[PDB]
Amino acid sequence: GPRVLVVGSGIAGLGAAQKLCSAPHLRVLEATASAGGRIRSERCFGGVVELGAHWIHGPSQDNPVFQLAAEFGLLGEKELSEENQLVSMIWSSSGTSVSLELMTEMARLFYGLIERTREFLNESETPMASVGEFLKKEISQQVASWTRKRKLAILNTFFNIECCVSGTHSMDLVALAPFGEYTVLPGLDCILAGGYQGLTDRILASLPKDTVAFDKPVKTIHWNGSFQEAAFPGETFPVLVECEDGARLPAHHVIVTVPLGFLKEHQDTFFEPPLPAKKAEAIKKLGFGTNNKIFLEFEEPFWEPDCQFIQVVWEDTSPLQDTALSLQDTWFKKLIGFLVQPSHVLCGFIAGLESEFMETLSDEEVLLSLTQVLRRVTGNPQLPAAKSVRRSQWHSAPYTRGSYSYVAVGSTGDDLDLMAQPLPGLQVLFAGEATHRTFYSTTHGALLSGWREADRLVSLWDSQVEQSRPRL
């Protein structure tokens, strides 16, 4: 049938291929040696760690990733329960515990303000450009009605957790009016115990034999042409995919699923002729930030067996001091804390420029510095050093160049719709998490965008017979 090339074998590319293959001549071209992309589960410390996607966000009926995980046998009773579908130790950098009552009070203050960002939905000329500016103004009003330093330090950790959630260096970089367009499905977030990559491996396995080609990065997509196949008779095609290895692959349709960070760096060379201006501008304007994981293995657990998260509050910090491009005093003060892995393993999370700095450090520097942080925040100078480390390095990854999109100051939800806009004749189509207006920065948004592009192409194919139908 028609020749389709899907660029990228993350969940969006795999989802598009699955729908289309189930009769086109279809190949998926993956730059790296395996499938999954930002779903990347690795065998480490004798078990499995998630370098990328970690949770099914909102594991309920309308989440297609939850439905596939269930179909594939990748979830347990708790995760599949009706109860789950319907839905900590806090340390200060002074080495003392933070009161649960005070933490609850500040969580209510902060998350109440996050809910108020909905007041800006559909506003053309917002008073403040960013979520961070709105939050800071409201916190300043609260402070004028108020220990005060301790409250501001706890609030600073909530800002840093929000940076992880948005995948931004700062909430001051996140556009205010578009913020509430992101949709949260119900359900208590859950992991896939065998690794998130089990999901993408199963979708790949259902494709026809050898659909996905690995270590096959694409250099340039040549479109808007009339290109002859290197065979006699020379059948003509609108597109040629030029691979980094020199392969010249003709196609009728190319579905691009590469990450937004890759497009920001390479859009000028990756498409010939250039992308239309409004699409090129959407790529530039949208946000694409870094969030990384730092796994630390210990010989023995120093935490309580029941502890799930070791949250850190950095004393004397305040969100009212920080601006959109300011850095914390040291890179590790951007770390929110550590999740206990369910061997004794912790998983630290860090977003932004301090996270990109962490990637430039050696494994030894990260391990030693974090051992020192842990000795400091737990108030135990004799805490044993971590045995080993495994960290993600998403900003450094040449085919990704960050973690996930956000609607940055200067962009709107309309830019995510421009990312999805196909090129004329559906010669080039776009899927991926940064093409979904309400589920961007998730696995289910990437999956849904791949199904969207497959449905768009099937409708074109089904319409071709009508070109030959006369009126009389």
Q: Which of residues 210-229 bind ligand FAD (CB under 6 A)?
A: 217-218
Least distance (Å) between residue 59 CB and ligand FAD: 10
Q: Is 218 assigned to a binding site?
A: yes
CB of 162 closer than 8 Å to CB of 289: no
Quick one: which of 4, 5, 17, 32 contacts ligand FAD (CB under 6 A)? 32
The residue to which tokens 């000329």 are assigned: 125
Pick from 57, 149, 145, 153: nearest CA to 110: 153
273: helix, strand or coil = coil
Quick one: which of 20, 27, 49, 57 contacts ligand FAD (CB under 6 A)? 57
* Of residues 155 and 351, the one with the C-beta less far from ligand FAD: 351
* Of residues 90 and 446, the one with the C-beta less far from ligand FAD: 446
Q: Is 12 assigned to a binding site?
A: yes
Report if residue 334 touches ligand FAD, rule: CB under 6 A: no
Binding mask 301-320 for ligand FAD (x = CB under 6 A): --------------------
Structure tokens at 198: 């089990």
Compute the C-alpha angle 354/356/362, nearest 5°. Answer: 100
Pick from 144, 111, 45: nearest CA to 344: 45
Size (the chain), residues:
472
Residues that contact ligand FAD, how many (by CB under 6 A): 39
What number of H helices and E strands is found in the chain? 14, 21
* Of residues 16 and 312, the one with the C-beta less far from ligand FAD: 16
CB of 434 closer than 8 Å to CB of 440: yes
Report if residue 12 touches ligand FAD, rule: CB under 6 A: yes
Report if residue 41 touches ligand FAD, rule: CB under 6 A: no
Least distance (Å) between residue 330 CB and ligand FAD: 21
Report if residue 437 touches ligand FAD, rule: CB under 6 A: no
Least distance (Å) between residue 9 CB and ligand FAD: 5
Distance CA 214, CA 259 (A): 17
421: helix, strand or coil = coil
Contact segment (CB under 6 A) with ligand FAD among 280-288, 355-363, 375-383, 435-443 equals: 435-443
Least distance (Å) between residue 355 CB and ligand FAD: 9
> In b/e form, how buried is each residue of 293-313, taking b as 16+ CB within 10 angstroms?
bbbbbbeeebbeeeeebbbbb
Least distance (Å) between residue 343 CB and ligand FAD: 21
> In b/e form, how buried is each residue of 11-21, taking b as 16+ CB within 10 angstroms?
bbbbbbbbbbb
CB of 326 closer than 8 Å to CB of 83: no
CA separation (Å) from 254 to 59, 218, 223, 261, 271? 31, 11, 9, 19, 11
Report if residue 348 touches ligand FAD, rule: CB under 6 A: no
Report if residue 31 touches ligand FAD, rule: CB under 6 A: yes
CA separation (Å) from 413 to 21, 63, 226, 439? 31, 21, 35, 11
* Of residues 273 and 381, the one with the C-beta less far from ligand FAD: 273
Quick one: which of 7, 190, 347, 420 contacts ligand FAD (CB under 6 A)? 7
Report if residue 258 touches ligand FAD, rule: CB under 6 A: yes
Report if residue 134 touches ligand FAD, rule: CB under 6 A: no
Least distance (Å) between residue 252 CB and ligand FAD: 19
Q: Is 397 assigned to a binding site?
A: no
* Of residues 212 and 373, the one with the C-beta less far from ligand FAD: 212
Q: Where are the beta strands (DSSP E) in 30-179?
A: 41-44, 47-50, 89-92
Q: Is 291 assigned to a binding site?
A: yes
Structure tokens at 178: 């578009």
Least distance (Å) between residue 461 CB and ligand FAD: 23
Pick out the residues of the known binding site for FAD: 12, 30, 38, 54-55, 218, 433, 442-443
Pick out the residues of the known binding site for substrate: 57, 165, 291
- The binding site for ligand FAD (CB under 6 A) comprises 7-13, 29-32, 37-39, 52-55, 57, 217-218, 257-259, 262, 291, 293, 392, 394, 399-400, 403-404, 432-433, 441-443, 446
